[PDB]
């Protein structure tokens, strides 16, 4: 909210120093890859279940 930018993951971009890691930054308009899937990494809810407030969600990359 403060930065007014959307967290977007540039799949084809190395990180600052990681050898084989992807880059995630804040894009002001979205590169069509800014879709994140909230999978149930908490292991409590199930696919399609309401995202429990405080649940250990998994914001995995989509693109």
């Amino acid at each position: 909210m403060k930065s007014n930018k959307y967290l977007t993951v540039n799949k084809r971009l190395p990180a600052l120093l990681e050898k084989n890691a992807m880059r995630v930054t804040l894009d002001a308009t979205g590169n069509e890859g800014s879709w994140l899937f909230i999978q149930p990494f908490w292991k409590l809810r199930s696919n399609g279940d309401n995202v429990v407030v405080g649940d250990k969600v998994i914001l995995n990359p989509v693109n």
Partner: protein, 63 residues
């Protein structure tokens, strides 16, 4: 249940006024659904709910 499913009048007080949350755990058993168990197999969660309800009924009886 079999402890207090009769009008024992003692085990019921012993259980409700317990500094363990167990009386709350029975309520949680009734209401809250067992997320991993229920999806894979639904009969056992039903049995748990039925037994919890029977225990709670046992907890009042002639009071």
């Amino acid at each position: 249940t079999e402890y207090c499913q009769g009008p024992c009048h003692e085990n019921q007080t012993c259980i409700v006024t317990h500094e363990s949350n167990g009386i709350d755990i029975i309520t949680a058993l009734i209401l809250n659904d067992i997320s991993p168990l229920c999806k894979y197999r639904m009969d056992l969660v039903l049995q748990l709910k039925d037994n919890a309800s029977k225990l709670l009924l046992a907890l009042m009886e002639s009071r």
